[PDB]
Amino acid sequence: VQLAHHFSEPEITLIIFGVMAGVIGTILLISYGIRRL
Amino acid sequence: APVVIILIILCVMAGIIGTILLISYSIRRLIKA
Amino acid sequence: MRFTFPLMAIVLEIAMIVLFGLFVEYFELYPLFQDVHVMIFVGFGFLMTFLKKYGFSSVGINLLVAALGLQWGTIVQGILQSQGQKFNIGIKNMINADFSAATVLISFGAVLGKTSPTQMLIMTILEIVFFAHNEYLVSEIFKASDIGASMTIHAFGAYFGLAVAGILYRSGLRKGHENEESAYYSDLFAMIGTLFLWMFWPSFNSAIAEPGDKQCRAIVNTYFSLAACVLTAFAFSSLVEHRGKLNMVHIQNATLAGGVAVGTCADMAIHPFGSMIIGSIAGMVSVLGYKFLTPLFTTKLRIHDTCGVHNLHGLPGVVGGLAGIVAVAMGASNTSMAMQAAALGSSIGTAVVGGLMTGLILKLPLWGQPSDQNCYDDSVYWKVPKTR
Amino acid sequence: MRFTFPLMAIVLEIAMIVLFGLFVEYIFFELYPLFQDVHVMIFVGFGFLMTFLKKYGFSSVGINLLVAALGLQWGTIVQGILQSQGQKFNIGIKNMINADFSAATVLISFGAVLGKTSPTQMLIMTILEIVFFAHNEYLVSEIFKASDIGASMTIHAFGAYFGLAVAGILYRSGLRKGHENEESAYYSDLFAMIGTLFLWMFWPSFNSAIAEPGDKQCRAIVNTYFSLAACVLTAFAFSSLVEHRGKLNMVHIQNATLAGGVAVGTCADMAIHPFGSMIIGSIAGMVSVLGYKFLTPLFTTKLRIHDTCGVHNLHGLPGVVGGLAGIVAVAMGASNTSMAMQAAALGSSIGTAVVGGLMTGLILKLPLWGQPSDQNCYDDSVYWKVPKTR
Amino acid sequence: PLQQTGQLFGGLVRDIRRRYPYYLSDITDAFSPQVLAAVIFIYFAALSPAITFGGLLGEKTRNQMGVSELLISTAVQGILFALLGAQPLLVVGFSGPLLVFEEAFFSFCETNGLEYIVGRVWIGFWLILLVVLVVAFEGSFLVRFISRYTQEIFSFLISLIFIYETFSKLIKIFQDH
Predict the structure, then answer these.
(1) B-chain residues within 8 Å CB-CB of C129?
(2) Residue C259: which residues within 8 A CB-CB, separation 6 or more?
(3) Which class would CATH give C3-363?
């Protein structure tokens, strides 16, 4: 018996991967902005 | 339901072929240049 | 890529093995099955060997396409008949798988010489899916009588192939091609396929006929339809040719139109006189189609049909459907008028739509399609001997 | 000399007539269509399969007919004598089917020495090989009690290794780097495709003719059907894989597409499932193509065994794969009979084929049968009137 | 191989450009009996650590991670690495240092009332973020500063530890019997 969560396993892992991709993209854009100005 | 199964089988085969061809094309475009 | 074809063949075979493991479990109709088998592999394959430089591809891709087709058609037709459950395999399953192979080979005749073996594997898979769905619709939803399959096999295969060939149109081939020509011994070899199809067609139209009166009538009506078709096809070949010379294209193909056009009415009580009427009309229509409609389709409608399958399978298949409707009109069968008409319309429409989608997939430059100059040439895909 | 071939044939025919008069007397109609299919396989399939040689089509098909016409009579006599233990026996449809099976074994052996032998040599080979084959098939069916309903070991492996032994004994030094007449032509290859297609289509009858009526015969038919279907796909795929620029090879398409029918033979009537039959067919096609590309060149040059039709790649290796498949099937529990008895049948089939082929080839090596020269090998004109026009 | 391009994922692109051209040779070069003998050797060499660390990971984690999980992970990652990796001769598997981490983490999760299986699901989530960033900025160029000194010290130490554990297993048999 497992506790019922609002997000299912595919939904929660998609959310986590999306937040991870946003963090990676933010880091890459920051690195792109630096070393140019 | 049989139509769903047949469409699922076609989707699996199409996905396998498309993924393999996509990997081959990506490797080719990375390797030639 | 030279590895696309072996990769697709191996992947498709592994998929076939897995599907058989998932869905498949384990004698008076076996001779009729073997007759249909000879029709599938010797008949069509050597019938298409008329091209002087495409005999290897004709017979070999016939064998490959039909071998893939029987497995895939077994799986799809069994899944349809079992509604996704496991099903057993008898002689009837093998016969119906050979019928699906026949449909794919009829469509192959439309695109012969302009497509790759990889394109042929893809077309086999997609076409068998569409054909099996339409045939289930005709047999179980409409419950129409098509025991010889003028509509579900011949008309479907012809218009599927025509839709594919229309999508795969090449501008450089509309005026003709130097490789698109027959040879003397090539036509001699094509006569082998013609004769085997003619000899064994009564088993084609009667294999899955209901035992008793229907199966006997399917055999007798097919035989006399072909007997009349031969005479009328010979007569009309001479009539449309200068000085009345016979054309081997007509005697190779239009001599078999009676078997196609009698398929719907094969098991029905149309009588041996009526079967001969149908066969004569089929031979005449097939000869007229080769001489006047094939140039019109190639030049004006931009639909190139290599083997003239519209004249052997399409027009005679439509004639067979209309004969079924008329036979229902005069009490030869207890099936409804509207269901025969709906079967004809559904077969033609499903064939056209499925052929459009399949040809759109086949148009992607990923399958090693031959160039315009290299069409109708074995050397694109085969090692060819130095002498004939 | 000039009359050796007709005199040997007339003496053999008179001997056949005398033996038939001394030993032969007169379910049939149910098994007759299967016999008809097997007959077509014997005389049209095997005969036209070997017509790929550009200057040897006449000898291919005609010597196939002479060997099989003689072989059916001689196999009837030998198999009936062995079964009846020297007593007079009655012939039925089973006798004809088994005689055509013996002829098939001899034709498989003939595929190895095609183009390098005389008709007299093939008469002698037919006579001796039928005795050897029938003695082994009686040992495997009656003493070892093995199940080989499709005869992967007794017909295919036996015939292939018998022919390989004869070809090794009849080895020609001046034919190891090739011969101008050893080559195909376009229409010769189309005739070979006629033979290939008839063999491929009628192989289920080949594998189910002697099977027990009911579930076993139907299982043999279904297994052969789907094994051949899978074999075609894998043969085409590996022919594209192993050749230069991915071009298909007509040798592979003509021969390796029957490897599934060869290999499913021992397991034909067993309950391996259709999917198991497809796995054997897929491997059989792969193994046949790889044999044709790599094994035949090595056997011809390193081992001095020239095999014209590549019958080792179609009947030899797939026959051994089928016998091994049968051993795995008994271990899986698909079949009755012991593992040791199946293994005994495989070893007996090869050992007998190699020993009998050695003695037969030693007899054939005598310079008395008008065998051709290295220069005249693969040429119909040695024995036939060949038309000027192709 | 250890130069820094300055382009994002530049080192990743160079490695694929270097090894994937040889992909056809990576299949044909295996057609030798030495490769098959290597298969039989490395099969046991990889299966036995999998089984032994599987018993320990299970004993120490209340079978929340055990032999079956380790075997499946080893097989899947080995297949994907041989199919896609740039140095196929590496053998991918569990190790000692990684067994000590699982015990420390399982003890940490036991102390703090945490679920060990979910904790790792989050550690794995953070691992993907790290390796993407390091590959993005060519962080594997820092490997060039590991000279033969450090390499040989690590190699000799790991070989000595392997021999010592192999003998300690035999010592443990004599003590039990």
Answers:
(1) 6, 10
(2) C148, C197, C198, C201, C204, C205, C222, C225, C226, C229
(3) mainly alpha
